[PDB]
Structures are given as structure tokens and as C-alpha cells.
């Protein structure tokens, strides 16, 4: 269909993102500088997010076969923005340490946060497809943007590899799935179906293919071996941004999609996501038990929280408040993620080169970095779902959403996990303040430990208080 | 066994098979007459036959699949990439509706003879020049398509008797004069004629991916080159010349004459234009030719959607 | 008078075999090779999926499609040729550092 | 299914046959016949290449069915071609396209 | 265009299965040509010229290109794995064929069962592709512009000598 001006105004922060990709590739043209660069990056998604509130000003409707911007939309838009914005930010300093091209890395940044724009308006399976392409080939130049560096290396080459096959994985179950119904939209995936004829086996099979493709990119079980590998090896402000940013876009459109789909609530895809998260819950938890590296645990970490989003998701087709339940718990998860691998950056940052070691070394992080050490600690008990933090209210609402729909292998499995997490996030959290024996002074590095507590203080304030949050959450409803 | 509808198509195809022979041999005296402006049909003939009784020699460390596969495509990628070009009406031997398509893909195969043949001449030296050549082709192949592409914006389809007939009027040659130019650059560059003769000259660590290839190869790289250009011109023709379009003399009197006009400007214009340098071709191709085939583009369309009303 | 079941298990044996061919090969670039085998499968079987129902979006699709294989081809083979520049070894299984 | 559709069918399947069996024929001739006795520029170049010739299918798709899209199609167009552009412009300014720096 | 189907069908699945278990790389490179030409011809037997002219012009013509370009260049003259041939072991490749085996009758069982009024064959032409791309599909356009550039700059960055 044609694009009304309306429509126009619908498409603000993709289209500031896309403009700011165009004007930072431009200046890097014209000058090769670090500061200007940034800052243009910077400035062009602050004025995403205040496009945000233009696009809230509007009303919610169908921008093309392809796009649809409702409350949804809004709020996947605003969480994929935040995390860009942080990336940013815990990127400058470490960029300031390396020695080759640093534009190129957040010119790379804008492109991905603009596939998550688009995964997050995304109601269409070619929408789907470039929005998840557009997130993944960018990460595969920013995991390996330190490429000198074996593991750095090492880590683009499976994540490039692996996410080549997914994709595959994913158009090929998009084929069938268009070979089965005739059209391409969410909410025609199925609705030429009647009479118990729901499960249609090419229709199962292209969404089967379909949850290959994404399950690989929500880090699920049996697609999960590339992400404690790629966390590790990856850059820490690209392990930032890919904990966060590609895996809340992602899963929001899986959501969408489940929630659209008249085959959404069929009874086999129904148990076979089931298995996935009960299995994502439990390997995750067993699996982060004798880490000592932080980033592979919370790798493994990011698999057993992306089930307990999956198990929100199961619920959906039977009660009504897991959209809020996975919106919650996606505002926690962004701002513990944040907080953990903003930490992880700032003690990494500036990069000492391919050659020097880049090993965290927690322990006894609080006697020469307090303000850090009370960041990790916060984040490591919102993480593991403690009260007073704004991870057990995501953990609440997972629970409750599942306890509703009488979903009682998923809630086990949810409380054996949780105790599991217990185990090695107070690991972690202790380790900070024992004795270690042995082993900044600008703005943007004290703009990262700004950022970083600034979510540990909103961790903790909605922890407490987190009736804003729901009502925000519940006031961004998609179209029904 | 009387029908006239076998007629017909035997009538088509004894026409294809005259256009296919007419521009085989127009291949090899356009060689003859170029190695005499810079009988003759005797001397052609006896040189065939010399390539032919001569020995064809395959290098021993050499694969010898590729080595045979590389004078195929160079010959039979624009040999085929003639058979959507109207050389009258009634005259053409496909009438395809993606055309200037077949056109693409016949030169993007096209790449390959070169990459090929210096892969399987077992030289160092050879896979640098034919690294070369293919950086060059590729560097010119990037714009051929858009350079056509004004002209398809003017006609609105891919066919190619749809663009001579748009052409009944003005000749595109006057509208889409920068998308003649660049195509003519671009069709110059993809055949390797001067001046984009030998990249290799550029350097004492290249060598001519032509050597090591004895006899009949040798003859069917050069015959290949010769009908490459023959098929270039009667696209530009077809294209930018009214294809068989004129006023008095029959139609393919007029298509005869535009195309040998454009063979004798190419012998022309090697004849007289110094080959620049490689940097310096690469450089033209990638920061001139491609933006101004792009703007003509803008250009075009812009003019056409103005003039309707 | 092509069946649709005919092409989809055509692009479904094209799929299978570079799946295949990703798997058994320790070459980078015969993974990258495969890679490429399905994802031309892939949109082989839009473009069928495509004119069965006879609509333009299968070819729209399989251009999205190729356009992802042409830019992942493009970083695939950076990466090899990385690889080859920093270990002059493309046995995948030697770039194998990280493990649980 | 016209006489002249499978006429011109017939036509280039005849083309294209005597055009590979004569070139085949020619090496079957003189084989038979006779008696007997690097550096990563070229990398980026071609990764361009490919690049922009999968932008120019975009045109090509768009170039075909100008007047049916309208002056909509048109602006569009324009800001395709204007990122095409300026990611040309990039690759020219840090030295991508430079081949003697 | 049935028997074009069928026959190029045909040779598309020899040619890849050639392709993977070959051991010189422009070998199995010209098989992959091969190959996607063969795929363009079952393209063209449907109607998809568009589609067709594309394998040939972007996947037949400018991807392998690519990667001829980094065979040749990487110069692979048999470096400890052709001397090998460890895919050619029973131990190796038995396993996953196996694998790719049950994944393709798993597919295959879901192909069949499902109701086929037949492909008309009838020619989509490139001037409708064009409408629909421009039209309903615009986005996808502008921001498949925008991942060419992010493959463009993160192969810019990894790809460069220095
Ligand atoms: C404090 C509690 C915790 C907060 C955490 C937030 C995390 C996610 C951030 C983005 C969330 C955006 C959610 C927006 C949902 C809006 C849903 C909706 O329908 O809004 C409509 C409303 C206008 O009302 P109405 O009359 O309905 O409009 C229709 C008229 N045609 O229009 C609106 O409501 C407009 C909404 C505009 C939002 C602008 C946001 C700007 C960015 C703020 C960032 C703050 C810093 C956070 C990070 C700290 C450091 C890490
Ligand atoms: C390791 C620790 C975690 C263990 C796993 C989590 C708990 C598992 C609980 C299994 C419950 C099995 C229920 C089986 C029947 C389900 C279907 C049914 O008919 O349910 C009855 C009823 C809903 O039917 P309705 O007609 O609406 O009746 C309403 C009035 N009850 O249902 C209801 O009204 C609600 C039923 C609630 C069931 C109990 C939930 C609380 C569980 C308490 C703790 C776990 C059990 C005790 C400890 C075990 C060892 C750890
Ligand atoms: C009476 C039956 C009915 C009532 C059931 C009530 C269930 C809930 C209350 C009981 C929970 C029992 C938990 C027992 C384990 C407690 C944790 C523990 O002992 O941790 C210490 C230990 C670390 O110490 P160490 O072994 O020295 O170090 C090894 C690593 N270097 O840690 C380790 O070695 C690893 C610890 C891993 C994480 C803890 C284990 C979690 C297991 C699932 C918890 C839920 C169990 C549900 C019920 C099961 C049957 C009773
Ligand atoms: C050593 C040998 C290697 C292999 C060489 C080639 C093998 C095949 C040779 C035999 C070909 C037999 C004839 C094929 C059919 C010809 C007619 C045809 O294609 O018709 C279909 C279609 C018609 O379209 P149209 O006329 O516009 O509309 C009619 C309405 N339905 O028209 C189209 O769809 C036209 C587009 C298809 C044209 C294909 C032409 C050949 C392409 C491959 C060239 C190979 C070059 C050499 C090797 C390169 C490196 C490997
Ligand atoms: C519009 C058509 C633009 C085509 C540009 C083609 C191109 O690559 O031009 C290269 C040109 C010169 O670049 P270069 O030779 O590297 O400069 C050395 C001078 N000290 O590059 C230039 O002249 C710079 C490009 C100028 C226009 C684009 C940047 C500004 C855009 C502002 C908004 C309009
Ligand atoms: C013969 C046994 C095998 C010998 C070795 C291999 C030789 C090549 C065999 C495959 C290619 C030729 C197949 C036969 C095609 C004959 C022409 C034909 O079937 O035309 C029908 C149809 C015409 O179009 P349409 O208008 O729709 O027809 C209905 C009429 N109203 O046509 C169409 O719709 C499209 C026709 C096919 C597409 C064009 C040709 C594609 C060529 C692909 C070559 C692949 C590489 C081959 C390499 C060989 C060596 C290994
Ligand atoms: C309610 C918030 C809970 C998480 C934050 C915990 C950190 C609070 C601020 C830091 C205080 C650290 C005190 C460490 C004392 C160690 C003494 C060791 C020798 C006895
Ligand atoms: C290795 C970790 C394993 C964790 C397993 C957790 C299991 C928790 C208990 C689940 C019990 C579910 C009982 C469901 C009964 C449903 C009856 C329905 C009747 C209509
Ligand atoms: C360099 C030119 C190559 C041309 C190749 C095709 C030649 C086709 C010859 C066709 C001749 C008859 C055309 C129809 C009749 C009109 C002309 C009558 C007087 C010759
Ligand atoms: C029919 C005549 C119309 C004249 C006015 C045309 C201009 C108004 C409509 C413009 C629509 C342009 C849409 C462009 C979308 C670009 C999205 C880029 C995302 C990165
Ligand atoms: C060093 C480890 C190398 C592993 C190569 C891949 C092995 C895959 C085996 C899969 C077998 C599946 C058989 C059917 C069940």
C-alpha cells in the first residue's frame, strides 16, 4: 500500500536511524574522528526516542503490508534503543584503546539497532527475515571487530557460520510455510484452516524450521552451544549489546508472531516450545554452575532466562497478561544485563591490544572498584530473582503467568533453576569482596559508570516500587 | 509430412542457424581486417587450417578441465549473448522477454573464460594478470547493466524489439547520451579492447593469460574476442540507433550499416587511443562511470514520469 | 502440470545436501560452500511456494534472500581469508580456543 | 502455444546447440587432428562488485515499472540511489577504491 | 516446461552432490556453477524470469566470482587435507548422511498430504516484481539497501590488508 504522510510520521525511528546511518557514514568520509562519529550515533537515537514519543503522539496502525506500530512497538523500539545507546557508551572507551578504523563500529551499532526497529514493528515474514538479518550481519563485523584477537576471531567465525545455517534454516521454513498459506502476513499463517485442521503437517514443518532459525538466535536448547563461546570471545560492549539488544528484538517477534498467528495456538508447537524452555531453564542453570568466566556465564545465564521468557510465551494463547509478564520481565532483563556486562566493560576498557590478556578477574573487585563491585552485585542478585530487585518481579510475573495457565512442568522446572541460579550468582557476588592478591580519568568512561548505575538504582527502585513500570508496560498493548 | 506450421519453424530455425554462421564469419574477417588495417578469406582459411593440423598441446601441471572450459566460454558467452539482438523484423532469433537480462547474464559468465584460463595455466605470473583483467571486468560489468538500464526505463520493458520500437522517432542515442557513452565504455571494457588491452603491461610479476594457450584455443579466444565485439555493436545498434529502423533502404540494410560503422570505430578507436593506466582505469570505471549511470537513471525517470499526463 | 510437492522436495534434497556438505566438511570454505547451497534451496523454494499461488512475493523473497547470501558470502570469505592470513591453516577444527 | 511462440522456441534451442556443438565440435577438430611429437585488493574490488550488482538488480526490478509506481516509486528510488551513493562516496573517501595508495 | 523441469531438477541435485564431496575447490566451484544454472533453468520452467535471471546474473555470476576469487588467491595446492581426504572415511560423513537422511524424509513426509492444484508454469514478468517492490515492499528495499552497506562495511573491515 502507499505511504501516507501519517505513515511517515509511524516511521520516525526508523527512519532517524537510517538517516543517522547515511549522515555518520558521511562524516566518516569526510574526517576519520572518534568523538564526532560518536556523538552523531548518539544524538541520532536520543532523537529515535524522542521520535518515540512523536510515534506515541500518533495512533497505531498498519504502515504496510510489512510494518505495524502499536503500544508493542513502541515499547520493543524504546528497549532496543536503550541498549544501543549503552552500547555506545561502554563502546568508547574500549574503542579509545584500540588502534585501527573506530567509526566503522558504530555505524555497525546503528545498522543492527535498526534491524531491531524493524524486528520490532515487524508483522510480515519478510519483515521478520530482513529485520533478523539486519540484527545478525553487523554483530558478525562487531564480535569480530577486534579480529587480530584469536578468541575475538574464533567468535565471529561460529557466530557468522552458525547464523548463516539459522537463517537457511528459518527462510527455508518461511517457504513452506508460504507454500502452505498463501499469504506471507502474521495473521494469515493458518487462517485458510477449519474443523481441527489446525495442524496442517507443511504448516508444522515450516514453523518447526522456523524455530530452528530463531531459537538459535534466542541462545534456546538444543541451538544454544554458540553462546558462551561467542559472549566470550566477542568484544565486552558487543557482548552488551548482543545479551541485549538482538535477543529482546528477537523475541518480540516471536512474540508478535505467536500471538498473531491463527496457528499460534496449536497444541503441538504448544509442547514442543514447552520441552524447549524446560530444557532452556535447566541446561542453562546446570550448565553456569563451575564457571569461573563471567561472560560464558552469563552466556549460559542469557539461555536460562530466554526460557523463562519462553515460558511466558507458552501461556499466551491461554491467559491474557503474558504480553505484560514478558514486558516486565524484558525491562528487568535489559537493565541486569546492562548493568552485568556494562561492569564487564568498563574493568576491560580501554583495549590492551590482541596480544595482552582480557580474563576479568572478579575477585576482590571491591577494594580497589566499589562503585562497580555494588553494580555487579546488584545485577548478580536480580539476575538470580532475589526480592528487592526488579528481576524477581519479572520472576513473579513469569510465575503467576504460568501458574495461570496451569503450566506446572514449566513452574518446576522455573524453581529448580532459580535455585540453581542462587548457587552461582552468589558465587560471583561474594567472590567481589573476598582479598585478591594481585591485579579512565576521562568523561566517557565515567558516562559508562554512570549508565551502569543508573541500572543498578532502577533495579533496585522498581524492585521496590515497580507499580510504574507495569502501568507503562500495560498501557503499550498491541492492536488485538 | 506437409504442414505449415512445420514450415514455420523450420523456416525460424534455418533463419537463427543464417544469423549464427553470418555472425561467425563476420567474426573472422573483422579479425582479418583488423590484422590488415593495423585473398584474405584465403589467408583466413589457411590460418584455420594451420590452427586446426597443429598440435593442441595441454601444459602437463596443468588441470586440464579448466584449460579446455575457459576458450568455450569466451567464445560462446557473447556468441549467445547475440541471440536477442532483431537484426530485422521478423529476423530475430528469440524474442525473450527479459532481453537485455540474457544480455547480463551471458557477460557475468563471461568473466569466467578469463578467470579461468589463468587459473589453469600453471603461472604465477598468468594468475596475476588474469587477477587483474577480472578486478578490471568486474570494475566495468558493475555499471553495464544500470548504463542499459536508462534506455529500459525509456522503452519500459526488458524486450528488445519493444526498444526498437520506442525507438521509432528519436534514436536513443540523443536522450540516454550518457548511458551511450558509459555503455560503450563498459561494452569496450568487458571484451578486453584497447585500450583496456592488457592490464598486465603494468607489471614484470604479470603475464598475459592468452599464453600457454596454443592452436586452436588460441583461435578460439580470438574469434571470440572479434564476435564479442561484433555482438556489442549490434546491441549498441539495437539499442541506441534504432536497431533496423530508417527512412528509405530496407531494414537490414540500415542494421548492417549502423553495426559495421561500429565495428570500423572500435578497430578506429583502437587505433588511435593510448591505454591509460591500470590504477587509473579502475579509478574511472568506479568513481565516474557508476555515479553518472546512476544519475542518469534519476534523470530518466524523473523526465518520463513528467511527460505523462 | 508441475506439481508444487515437486518442487519443495527439490529445493528440500538441495537443502539436505548443503546441510550435508556443511557438516561433514572440516574446510572452512567448503562450509561456506555448503552455506551457499542452502541458502540458494531456501530460495528456490520461495520462488515455487511463489508460482504456485502465483504471486510476486516469492521472487521478492528470493530477492531479500539472495541479497542476505551475497553480503554473508562477502563476510564469510573476509573471515577466511583472516583466518588463512593469521593461522595459513583452514581447518576449522583448529580454530577451537574457547570450550566449556 | 502460438505457432510462432514454439517456432522462436525451437529457434533458440537450435542456437544455442549449434553454437555449443560448433565450439565443441572446433576443439574435437584440432585436438584430434595433427600429427604429435596474493593481495587482498582484488578481494575488495570483487566483494564490490557484487555489492552493487545486487543494488543494481533493485534498479533493474524498479527500472521496468517506472511509470506504473509513480512519482512515489520515484522518491523511493532517489533514496536508494542516494545511500548507494553514499556508500560509494565512503568507499572512495577511506581509500577502499584506491588501488596505488 | 515440465521435462525442463524435471531434467535440470535433475542435474542440479548431481551437480551439489558432486559439489560436497569433491575435493579440489574450483572442481566443486565450476559444479556449483553448474549447479545454479540449473536452478535458473527450473526457475524459467516456472514462469520466474525474474528469478532466473538473477541466479544467473547475481548467484552464477557475482557470488562465485567471489569465491573463485578467494580460491584462487588463497591458492589451496592441497594443504594437509587434501593428502587427507578425511570426509571420504565412513566414520566421517556415515553419521550426518544419516542425519541429513532423516531431516529430508521428515520434510519430504511433510510435502506430500498437501492439496496442489498444480503450478501453472504462466510467466511473472520482472515489470511486476518491480511494482510489487516498489509498492507493498518498499521497506524492504531502503533497509535491504541498509544490510548490503553493513555487509559492505563489516567485509571492508576484516577483509583489508594493511
Ligand atoms: C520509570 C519507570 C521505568 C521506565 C523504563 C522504560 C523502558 C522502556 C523505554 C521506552 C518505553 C516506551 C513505552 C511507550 C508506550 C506507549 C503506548 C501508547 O499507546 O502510548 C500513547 C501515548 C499517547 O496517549 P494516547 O492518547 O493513547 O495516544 C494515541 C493518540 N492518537 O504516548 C505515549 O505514551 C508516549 C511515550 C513516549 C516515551 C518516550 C521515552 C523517551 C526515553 C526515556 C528514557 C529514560 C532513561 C532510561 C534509561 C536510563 C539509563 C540506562
Ligand atoms: C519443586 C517445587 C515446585 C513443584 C511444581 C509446581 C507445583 C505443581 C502442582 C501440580 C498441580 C496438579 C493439578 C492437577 C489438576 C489440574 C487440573 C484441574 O482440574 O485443576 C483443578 C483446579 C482447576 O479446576 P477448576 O474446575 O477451575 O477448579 C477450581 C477450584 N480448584 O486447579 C486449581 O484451582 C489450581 C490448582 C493448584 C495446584 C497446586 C499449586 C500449588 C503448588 C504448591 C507447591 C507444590 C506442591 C507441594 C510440594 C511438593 C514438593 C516440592
Ligand atoms: C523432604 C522432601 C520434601 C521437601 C523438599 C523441599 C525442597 C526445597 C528445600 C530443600 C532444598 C535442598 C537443597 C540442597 C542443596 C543445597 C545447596 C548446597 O548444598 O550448596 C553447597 C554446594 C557447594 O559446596 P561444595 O559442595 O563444597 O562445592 C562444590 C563446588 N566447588 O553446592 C553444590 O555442590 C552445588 C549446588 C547447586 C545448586 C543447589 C542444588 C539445587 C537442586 C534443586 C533445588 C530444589 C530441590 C527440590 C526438591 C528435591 C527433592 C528433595
Ligand atoms: C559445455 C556445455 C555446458 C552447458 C551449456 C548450456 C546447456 C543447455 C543447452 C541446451 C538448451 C536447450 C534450449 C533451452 C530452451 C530455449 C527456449 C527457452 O528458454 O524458452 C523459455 C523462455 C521463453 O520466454 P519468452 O519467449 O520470453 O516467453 C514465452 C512465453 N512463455 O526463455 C527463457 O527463459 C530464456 C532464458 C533462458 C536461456 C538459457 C540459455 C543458456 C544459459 C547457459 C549458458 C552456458 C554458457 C557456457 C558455460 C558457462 C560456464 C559454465
Ligand atoms: C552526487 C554524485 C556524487 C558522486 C561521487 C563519486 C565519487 O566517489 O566521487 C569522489 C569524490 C572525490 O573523492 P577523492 O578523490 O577521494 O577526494 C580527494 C580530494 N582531496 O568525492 C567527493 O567529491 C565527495 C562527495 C561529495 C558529495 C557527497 C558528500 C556530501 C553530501 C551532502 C548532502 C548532499
Ligand atoms: C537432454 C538431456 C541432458 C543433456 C545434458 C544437459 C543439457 C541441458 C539440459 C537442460 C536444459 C534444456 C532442457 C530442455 C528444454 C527444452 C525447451 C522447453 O522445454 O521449452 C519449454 C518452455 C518454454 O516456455 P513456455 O512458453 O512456458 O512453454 C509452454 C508453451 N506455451 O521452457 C521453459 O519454460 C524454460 C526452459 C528451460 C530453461 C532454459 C534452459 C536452461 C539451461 C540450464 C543448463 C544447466 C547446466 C547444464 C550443464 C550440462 C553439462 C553438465
Ligand atoms: C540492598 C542492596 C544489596 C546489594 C548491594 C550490596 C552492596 C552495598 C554497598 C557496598 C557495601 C560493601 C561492604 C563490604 C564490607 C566487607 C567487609 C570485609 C571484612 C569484614
Ligand atoms: C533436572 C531438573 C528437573 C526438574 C523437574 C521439575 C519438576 C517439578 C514438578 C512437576 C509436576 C507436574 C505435575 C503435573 C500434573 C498435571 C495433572 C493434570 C490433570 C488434568
Ligand atoms: C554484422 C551484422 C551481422 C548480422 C547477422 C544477421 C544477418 C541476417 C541477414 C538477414 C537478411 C534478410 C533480412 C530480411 C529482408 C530485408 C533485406 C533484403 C535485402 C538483403
Ligand atoms: C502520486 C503523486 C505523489 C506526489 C508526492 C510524492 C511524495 C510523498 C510520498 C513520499 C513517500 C516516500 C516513502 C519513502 C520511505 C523511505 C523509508 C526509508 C527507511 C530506511
Ligand atoms: C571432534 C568432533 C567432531 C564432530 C563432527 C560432527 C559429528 C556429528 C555426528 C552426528 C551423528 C548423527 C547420527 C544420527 C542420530
Known sequence: ?480 | ?309 | ?100 | ?101 | MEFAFYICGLIAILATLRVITHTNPVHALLYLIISLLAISGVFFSLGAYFAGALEIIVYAGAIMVLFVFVVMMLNLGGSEIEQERQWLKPQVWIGPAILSAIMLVVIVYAILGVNDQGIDGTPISAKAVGITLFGPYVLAVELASMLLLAGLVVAFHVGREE
Open chain 1, 1 to 480: 500500500m502507499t505511504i501516507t504522510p501519517q505513515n511517515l510520521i509511524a516511521l520516525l525511528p526508523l527512519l532517524i536511524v537510517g538517516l543517522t546511518v547515511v549522515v555518520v557514514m558521511l562524516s566518516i568520509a569526510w574526517r576519520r574522528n572518534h568523538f564526532l562519529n560518536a556523538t552523531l550515533s548518539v544524538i541520532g537515537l536520543n532523537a529515535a526516542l524522542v521520535s518515540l514519543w512523536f510515534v506515541g503522539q500518533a495512533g497505531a496502525m498498519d504502515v504496510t503490508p510489512l510494518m505495524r506500530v502499536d503500544g508493542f512497538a513502541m515499547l520493543y523500539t524504546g528497549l532496543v534503543l536503550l541498549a544501543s545507546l549503552a552500547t555506545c557508551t561502554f563502546a568508547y572507551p574500549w574503542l579509545e584503546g584500540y588502534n585501527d578504523n573506530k567509526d566503522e563500529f558504530y555505524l555497525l551499532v546503528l545498522i543492527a539497532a535498526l534491524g531491531g526497529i524493524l524486528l520490532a514493528n515487524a508483522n510480515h515474514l519478510a519483515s521478520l527475515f530482513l529485520g533478523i538479518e539486519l540484527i545478525s550481519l553487523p554483530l558478525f563485523g562487531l564480535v569480530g571487530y577486534a579480529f587480530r584477537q584469536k578468541r575475538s576471531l574464533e567468535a565471529s567465525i561460529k557466530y557468522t557460520i552458525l547464523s548463516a545455517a539459522a537463517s537457511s534454516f528459518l527462510l527455508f521454513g518461511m517457504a513452506l510455510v508460504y507454500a502452505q498459506s498463501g499469504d506471507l502476513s502474521f495473521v494469515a499463517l493458518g487462517k485458510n484452516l477449519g474443523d481441527g485442521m489446525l495442524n496442517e503437517p507443511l504448516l508444522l514443518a515450516g514453523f518447526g524450521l522456523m524455530i530452528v532459525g530463531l531459537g538459535f538466535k534466542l541462545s534456546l536448547v538444543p541451538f544454544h552451544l554458540w553462546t558462551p563461546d561467542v559472549y566470550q570471545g566477542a568484544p565486552a560492549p558487543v557482548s552488551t549489546f548482543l545479551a541485549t539488544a538482538s535477543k529482546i528484538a528477537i523475541f518480540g517477534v516471536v512474540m508478535r508472531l505467536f500471538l498473531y498467528a491463527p496457528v499460534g495456538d496449536s497444541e503441538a508447537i504448544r509442547v514442543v516450545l514447552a520441552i524447549i524452555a524446560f530444557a532452556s531453564i535447566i541446561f542453562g542453570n546446570l550448565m553456569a554452575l563451575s564457571q569461573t568466566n563471567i561472560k560464558r556465564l552469563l552466556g549460559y545465564s542469557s539461555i536460562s532466562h530466554l526460557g523463562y521468557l519462553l515460558v511466558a510465551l507458552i501461556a499466551l494463547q491461554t491467559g491474557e497478561m503474558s504480553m505484560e509478564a514478558v514486558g516486565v520481565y524484558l525491562a528487568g532483563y535489559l537493565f541486569s544485563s546492562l548493568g552485568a556486562f556494562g561492569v564487564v566493560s568498563l574493568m576491560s576498557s580501554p583495549y590492551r591490544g590482541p596480544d595482552a590478556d582480557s580474563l576479568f578477574s572478579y575477585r576482590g573487585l571491591f577494594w580497589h572498584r566499589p562503585i562497580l563491585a555494588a553494580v555487579m552485585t546488584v545485577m548478580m542478585l536480580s539476575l538470580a530473582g532475589i526480592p528487592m530487585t526488579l528481576g524477581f518481579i519479572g520472576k513473579f510475573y513469569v510465575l503467576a503467568v504460568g501458574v495461570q495457565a496451569h503450566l506446572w512442568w514449566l513452574v518446576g522446572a522455573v524453581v529448580v533453576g532459580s535455585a540453581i541460579g542462587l548457587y552461582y550468582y552468589l558465587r560471583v557476588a561474594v567472590s567481589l569482596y573476598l582479598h585478591a592478591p594481585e591485579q579512565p580519568s576521562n568523561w566517557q568512561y565515567s558516562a559508562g559508570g554512570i549508565v551502569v548505575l543508573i541500572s543498578a538504582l532502577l533495579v533496585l527502585v522498581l524492585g521496590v516500587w515497580p507499580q510504574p513500570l507495569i502501568s507503562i508496560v500495560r498501557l503499550a498493548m498491541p492492536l488485538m
Open chain 4, 1 to 101: 502455444t502460438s505457432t510462432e511462440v514454439i517456432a522462436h522456441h525451437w529457434a533458440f534451442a537450435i542456437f544455442l546447440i549449434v553454437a555449443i556443438g560448433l565450439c565443441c565440435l572446433m576443439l574435437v577438430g584440432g585436438w584430434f587432428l595433427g600429427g604429435r611429437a596474493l593481495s587482498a585488493k582484488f578481494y575488495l574490488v570483487a566483494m564490490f562488485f557484487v555489492i552493487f550488482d545486487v543494488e543494481a538488480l533493485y534498479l533493474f526490478a524498479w527500472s521496468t515499472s517506472i511509470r506504473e509506481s509513480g512519482w512515489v516509486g520515484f522518491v523511493e528510488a532517489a533514496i536508494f540511489i542516494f545511500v548507494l551513493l553514499a556508500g560509494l562516496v565512503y568507499l572512495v573517501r577511506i581509500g577502499a577504491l584506491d588501488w596505488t595508495p
Open chain 3, 1 to 100: 502440470m508441475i506439481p508444487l510437492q515437486h518442487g519443495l522436495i527439490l529445493a528440500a534434497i538441495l537443502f539436505v545436501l548443503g546441510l550435508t556438505g556443511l557438516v561433514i566438511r572440516r574446510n572452512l570454505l567448503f562450509m561456506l560452500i555448503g552455506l551457499e547451497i542452502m541458502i540458494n534451496a531456501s530460495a528456490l523454494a520461495f520462488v515455487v511456494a511463489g508460482s504456485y499461488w502465483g504471486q510476486t512475493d516469492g521472487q521478492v523473497m528470493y530477492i531479500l534472500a539472495i541479497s542476505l547470501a551475497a553480503a554473508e558470502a562477502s563476510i564469510g570469505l573476509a573471515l577466511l581469508l583472516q583466518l588463512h592470513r593469521r593461522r595459513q591453516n583452514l581447518n576449522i577444527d583448529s580454530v577451537s580456543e574457547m570450550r566449556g
Open chain 2, 1 to 309: 509430412w506437409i504442414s505449415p506450421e512445420l514450415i514455420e519453424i523450420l523456416l525460424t530455425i534455418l533463419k537463427a542457424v543464417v544469423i549464427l554462421l553470418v555472425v561467425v564469419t563476420c567474426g573472422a574477417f573483422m579479425s582479418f581486417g583488423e590484422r590488415r588495417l593495423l585473398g584474405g578469406s584465403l589467408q583466413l582459411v589457411a590460418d584455420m587450417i594451420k590452427m586446426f593440423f597443429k598440435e593442441d598441446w595441454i601444459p602437463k601441471f596443468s588441470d586440464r578441465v579448466i584449460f579446455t572450459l575457459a576458450p568455450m566460454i569466451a567464445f560462446t558467452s557473447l556468441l549467445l549473448a547475440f541471440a536477442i539482438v532483431p537484426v530485422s523484423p521478423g529476423w530475430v532469433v528469440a524474442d525473450l522477454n527479459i532481453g537485455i537480462l540474457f544480455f547480463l547474464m551471458m557477460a557475468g559468465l563471461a568473466v569466467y573464460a578469463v578467470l579461468f584460463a589463468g587459473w589453469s595455466s600453471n603461472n604465477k605470473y598468468s594468475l596475476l594478470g588474469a587477477m587483474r583483467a577480472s578486478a578490471q571486468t568486474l570494475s566495468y560489468e558493475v555499471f553495464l547493466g544500470l548504463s542499459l538500464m536508462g534506455v529500459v526505463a525509456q522503452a519500459g520493458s526488458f524486450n528488445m524489439t519493444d526498444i526498437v520500437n520506442s525507438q521509432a522517432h528519436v534514436w536513443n542515442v540523443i536522450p540516454q547520451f550518457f548511458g551511450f557513452i558509459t555503455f560503450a565504455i563498459a561494452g569496450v571494457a568487458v571484451c578486453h579492447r584497447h585500450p583496456f588491452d592488457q592490464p598486465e603491461a603494468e607489471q614484470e610479476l604479470a603475464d598475459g593469460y592468452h599464453i600457454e594457450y596454443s592452436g586452436m584455443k588460441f583461435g578460439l579466444f580470438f574469434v571470440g574476442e572479434y564476435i564479442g565485439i561484433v555482438t556489442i555493436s549490434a546491441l549498441m545498434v539495437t539499442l541506441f540507433f534504432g536497431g533496423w529502423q530508417g527512412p528509405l533502404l530496407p531494414p537490414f540494410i540500415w542494421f548492417a550499416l549502423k553495426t559495421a560503422f561500429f565495428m570500423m570505430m572500435f578497430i578506429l578507436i583502437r587505433a588511435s587511443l593510448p591505454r591509460p593506466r591500470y590504477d587509473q582505469v579502475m579509478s574511472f570505471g568506479w568513481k565516474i562511470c557508476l555515479p553518472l549511470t546512476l544519475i542518469n537513471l534519476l534523470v530518466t525517470a524523473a523526465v518520463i514520469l513528467w511527460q505523462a499526463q
